Design a protein around this ligand. Structure first.
Ligand SMILES: NC(=O)OC[C@@H](O)C[C@H](NC(=O)[C@H]1NCCC[C@H]1O)C(=O)N[C@@H](Cc1c[nH]cn1)C(=O)N[C@H](C(=O)O)[C@H](O)c1c[nH]c(Cl)n1
Ligand SMILES: [K+]
Ligand SMILES: [K+]
Ligand SMILES: [K+]
Ligand SMILES: [K+]
Ligand SMILES: [K+]
Ligand SMILES: [K+]
Ligand SMILES: [K+]
Ligand SMILES: [K+]
Ligand SMILES: [K+]
Ligand SMILES: [K+]
Ligand SMILES: [K+]
Ligand SMILES: [K+]
Ligand SMILES: [K+]
Ligand SMILES: [Mg+2]
Ligand SMILES: [Mg+2]
Ligand SMILES: [Mg+2]
Ligand SMILES: [Mg+2]
Ligand SMILES: [Mg+2]
Ligand SMILES: [Mg+2]
Ligand SMILES: [Mg+2]
Ligand SMILES: [Mg+2]
Ligand SMILES: [Mg+2]
Ligand SMILES: [Mg+2]
Ligand SMILES: [Mg+2]
Ligand SMILES: [Mg+2]
Ligand SMILES: [Mg+2]
Ligand SMILES: [Mg+2]
Ligand SMILES: [Mg+2]
Ligand SMILES: [Mg+2]
Ligand SMILES: [Mg+2]
Ligand SMILES: [Mg+2]
Ligand SMILES: [Mg+2]
Ligand SMILES: [Mg+2]
Ligand SMILES: [Mg+2]
Ligand SMILES: [Mg+2]
Ligand SMILES: [Mg+2]
Ligand SMILES: [Mg+2]
Lengths: 52, 106, 54, 88, 117
RNA sequence: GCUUGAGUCUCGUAGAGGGGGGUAGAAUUCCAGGUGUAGCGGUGAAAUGCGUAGAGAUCUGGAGGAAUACCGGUGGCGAAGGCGGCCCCCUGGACGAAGACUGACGCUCAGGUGCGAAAGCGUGGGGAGCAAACAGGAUUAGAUACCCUGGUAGUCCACGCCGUAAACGAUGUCGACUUGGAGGUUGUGCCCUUGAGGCGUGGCUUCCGGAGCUAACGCGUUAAGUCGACCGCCUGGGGAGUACGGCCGCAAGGUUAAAACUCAAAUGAAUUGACGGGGGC
């Protein structure tokens, strides 16, 4: 097995796992109201998009 | 009359005291006029993650019908017996007696 | 009918290799069965029939 | 929270017929039995406010039914409150 | 001065610094280097180039051991998780197994407050 | 009298509804030990700070507290506040099918009584992380701040108190009626061979939109449409939800609630421009 194929494999596995996004979201604290605000905003766009 | 499902894992080194444990537990149950709807003793299977620095354990499944008091006693014996490393008592809607997938695969 | 926590083989169809439960939007499962699936997966992870992580 | 047999026997005792589950007397009797049964639970769990709301609903329902029965006729009202041991 | 054919590499890549340590399979560390320790000092240590030079310095630090089979694991989100692993190849170690371990708290402890910059 | 409103019983269903008790894994911190060396940490840039008394990194073991990645959802439950690992015990409500039962037993309420985020208060525990106050390092013209390194109350538990929030849908409760479309979730009836699937019928819920309504924005069968019952509340902006009095509270304070005086405005929605350390080309 070549090294470089193992690298992209590992890179793909890391991207699929989503650990980096989880870490970058858990870096600082988010108050519940703000998190709920983000969730609602992300839903109102996905809808007004899918509709568009 | 409540139906319960009990799964308990025991340290493998005590696994020759598993034919033993089943005996007294079934005793208590029928002692209370309960019915052992199902007993399975698939054992020595590998754990997904280590428990108590161990890597394998002896499993025993028991679907039973019993009143609460016998169930609570069993729980305390599980809690105090050092051979049992894990236990879990669950309620079931009705009696179940058909073979679990752990033995039907065997 | 009921999704059994002991039936490991079908449960491994709903977890990633890292052990995380797969979103229902990927497996196309109904909501009720997704809830029973999550309950059974957690129950199995307690009994060490499934791993929490990899 | 009453078992099926307890409910059935209360219905048989306070109603005219075994199928008479809607009469005022059996309704008050079932409400009283449920309240008495729940008294112990709320003795043990003083901060179960959400269940205490349902208990208060049972109390208010019994009050309303007793007032209706008292207005309807005082004979059955007096007989029932003396048989159930209610102050008023 | 012993020889260890099968060695492990630990890559602690933070948002600010990169630390590469070669240890043995049992975890007893036998060499280490950092982006700051490699000569960079300050924000420069956050650059992936500093990560490559840290990997090279660690590889130099582990020559005396007979290390040829390197099992790599990387922890952290910072920009030193890909350059570093490409420098260990240029150094010459045979990379056998590569894994990613990164602490995910499963909602354990309250993180610090957001910076209002 | 009656059964259509209201309620009772029988059988099931879904649910982070509530209270109590156990338990699991991940992570942070600390402690002990092993390996091992000169940095680590932090920022816009730095500097306080930690480190050869051996840190940071890595491995093993232990202690402890708090919170439950994924599932997870414009999903669900609850009167509202709110409720999220898993298991058990106690317990509330809702909904559906079919039938039986009672016979207006209803709706809404001034006073009244309960519940009521977070912060706060009292007593006693607990204390990992975070963090008002505070200390130091920066920045600046100054920085009492934003940024950095630390850090106490508090955040957690038990029992009391407090009773307030943009406690919001800024939309009181109950009932009736009035075109549609696309979804979600949860029951149930009849049928392709049912599991998949085709026709209906209930509950809850999201988004468009018709008539109508509206100052406009918008609402639009979950109305802000058409009506009825009852309750709460408003009468220009300030002064002021303040003073005084009463009630409540350990206290912080809460609640009820003026007047003198002063101005001719204050205000809502939308329009055209101008700007923005707002976005696009
Ligand atoms: N008069 C006086 O007190 O200082 C002069 C003031 O105008 C400086 C100005 N300051 C800021 O923006 C604050 N914004 C919030 C975070 C902290 C701070 O940064 C500023 O220009 N900063 C620069 C950094 C800097 C240069 N010289 C001194 N400080 C800056 O980077 N500002 C960023 C921005 O303007 O978008 C941003 O605020 C930021 C990133 N990182 C940090 Cl720290 N701040
Ligand atoms: K329940
Ligand atoms: K009649
Ligand atoms: K801090
Ligand atoms: K300035
Ligand atoms: K503290
Ligand atoms: K208060
Ligand atoms: K709101
Ligand atoms: K529906
Ligand atoms: K249907
Ligand atoms: K207009
Ligand atoms: K009212
Ligand atoms: K005036
Ligand atoms: K005080
Ligand atoms: Mg009832
Ligand atoms: Mg940085
Ligand atoms: Mg920080
Ligand atoms: Mg619950
Ligand atoms: Mg519970
Ligand atoms: Mg050490
Ligand atoms: Mg009132
Ligand atoms: Mg509080
Ligand atoms: Mg206190
Ligand atoms: Mg204290
Ligand atoms: Mg600070
Ligand atoms: Mg200061
Ligand atoms: Mg200064
Ligand atoms: Mg104080
Ligand atoms: Mg108010
Ligand atoms: Mg709210
Ligand atoms: Mg209001
Ligand atoms: Mg609801
Ligand atoms: Mg509309
Ligand atoms: Mg209306
Ligand atoms: Mg209007
Ligand atoms: Mg006042
Ligand atoms: Mg106020
Ligand atoms: Mg006053």
């Amino acid at each position: 097995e070549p090294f470089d194929v193992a690298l992209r494999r590992f890179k793909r596995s890391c991207e699929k796992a989503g650990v980096l996004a989880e870490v970058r979201r858990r870096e600082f604290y988010e108050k519940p109201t703000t998190e709920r605000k983000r969730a609602k905003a992300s839903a109102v766009k996905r809808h007004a998009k899918k509709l568009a | 009359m409540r139906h319960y499902e009990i799964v308990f894992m025991v340290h493998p080194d005590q696994s020759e005291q598993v034919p033993g444990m089943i005996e007294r537990y079934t005793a208590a149950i029928t002692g209370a006029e309960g019915k052992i709807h199902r007993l399975e003793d698939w054992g020595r299977r590998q754990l997904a993650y280590p428990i108590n620095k161990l890597h394998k354990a002896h499993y025993v499944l028991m679907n039973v019908e019993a009143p609460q008091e016998v169930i609570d006693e069993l729980e305390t014996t599980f809690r105090f017996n050092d051979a049992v490393i894990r236990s879990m008592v669950m309620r079931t809607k009705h009696a179940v007696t058909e073979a679990s997938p752990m033995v039907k695969a065997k | 009918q009921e999704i059994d926590y002991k039936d490991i083989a079908t449960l491994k169809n709903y977890i990633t290799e890292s052990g995380k439960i797969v979103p229902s939007r990927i497996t196309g499962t109904r909501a009720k069965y997704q809830r029973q699936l999550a309950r059974a997966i957690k129950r199995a992870r307690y009994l060490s029939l499934l791993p929490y992580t990899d | 929270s009453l078992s099926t047999e307890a409910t059935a026997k209360i219905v048989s005792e306070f109603g005219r017929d075994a199928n008479d589950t809607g009469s005022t007397e059996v309704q008050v009797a079932l409400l009283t039995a449920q309240i008495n049964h729940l008294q112990g639970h709320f003795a043990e769990h003083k901060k179960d406010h959400h269940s205490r709301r349902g208990l208060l609903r049972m109390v208010s329902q019994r009050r309303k039914l007793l007032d209706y029965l008292k207005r309807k006729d005082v004979a059955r009202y007096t007989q029932l409150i003396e048989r159930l041991g209610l102050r008023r | 001065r012993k020889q260890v054919s099968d060695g492990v590499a630990h890559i602690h890549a933070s948002f600010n610094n990169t630390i590469v340590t070669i240890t043995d399979r049992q975890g007893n560390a036998l060499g280490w280097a950092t982006a700051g320790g490699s000569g960079f000092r300050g924000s420069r240590k956050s650059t992936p180039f500093a990560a490559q030079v840290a990997a090279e310095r660690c590889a130099d630090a582990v020559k005396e051991y007979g290390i040829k089979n390197l099992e790599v694991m990387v922890k952290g989100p910072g920009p030193g998780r890909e350059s570093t692993i490409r420098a260990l190849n240029a150094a010459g170690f045979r990379i056998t197994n590569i894994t990613d371990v990164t602490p995910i708290p499963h909602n354990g402890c309250r993180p610090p407050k957001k910076r209002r910059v």
